[PDB]
């Protein structure tokens, strides 16, 4: 669940992991092509809008998250770990990330 992954990445930013960021950018269309290859679910604008608040927090564009993700997928993590995991974590929903890492969330 890419949508979970992006949230997790946002958590990573909150947690101060930063090496995995890059200064590149991507398009949703381009991203989805890469995702499809790797049997990742596509990111839709719906989930962009889900991730909007998280983008607000971290100042990182969703597409920029996608781009950095793209590099991560293509080249792998190169033995590196993120949040002490050697595996890209897709277990955490955006809501969970938001709950833990945005303090009090308004409705």
Swiss-Prot record:
It is found in: Host cytoplasm; Host Golgi apparatus; Host nucleus. Inhibited by pyridone-containing alpha-ketoamides compounds 13a and 13b. In turn, alpha-ketoamide 13b (tert-butyl (1-((S)-1-(((S)-4-(benzylamino)-3,4-dioxo-1-((S)-2-oxopyrrolidin-3-yl)butan-2-yl)amino)-3-cyclopropyl-1-oxopropan-2-yl)-2-oxo-1,2-dihydropyridin-3-yl)carbamate) inhibits SARS-CoV-2 replication in human lung cells. Inhibited ex vivo by michael acceptor inhibitor N3. Inhibited ex vivo by compound 11a and 11b. It catalyses: TSAVLQ-|-SGFRK-NH2 and SGVTFQ-|-GKFKK the two peptides corresponding to the two self-cleavage sites of the SARS 3C-like proteinase are the two most reactive peptide substrates. The enzyme exhibits a strong preference for substrates containing Gln at P1 position and Leu at P2 position. Cleaves the C-terminus of replicase polyprotein at 11 sites. Recognizes substrates containing the core sequence [ILMVF]-Q-|-[SGACN]. Cleaves and inactivates human TRMT1, preventing tRNA guanine(26)-dimethylation of tRNAs. May cleave human NLRP1 in lung epithelial cells, thereby activating the NLRP1 inflammasome pathway. May cleave human GSDMD, triggering alternative GSDME-mediated epithelial cell death upon activation of the NLRP1 inflammasome, which may enhance the release interleukins 1B, 6, 16 and 18. Also able to bind an ADP-ribose-1''-phosphate (ADRP). 3CL-PRO exists as monomer and homodimer. Only the homodimer shows catalytic activity. Interacts with host FBXO22; this interaction promotes the proteasomal degradation of nsp5. This is 3C-like proteinase nsp5. The gene is rep.
């Amino acid at each position: 669940i890419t949508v979970n992954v992006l949230a997790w990445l946002y958590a990573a930013v909150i947690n101060g992991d930063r090496w995995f960021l890059n200064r590149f950018t991507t398009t949703l269309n381009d991203f989805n092509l890469v995702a499809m290859k790797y049997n990742y679910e596509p990111l839709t604008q719906d989930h962009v809008d889900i991730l909007g608040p998280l983008s607000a927090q971290t100042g990182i564009a969703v597409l920029d998250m996608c781009a950095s993700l793209k590099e991560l997928l293509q080249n792998g993590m190169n033995g590196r770990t993120i949040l002490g995991s050697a595996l890209l974590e897709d277990e955490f929903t955006p809501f969970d990330v938001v709950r833990q890492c945005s303090g009090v969330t308004f409705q």
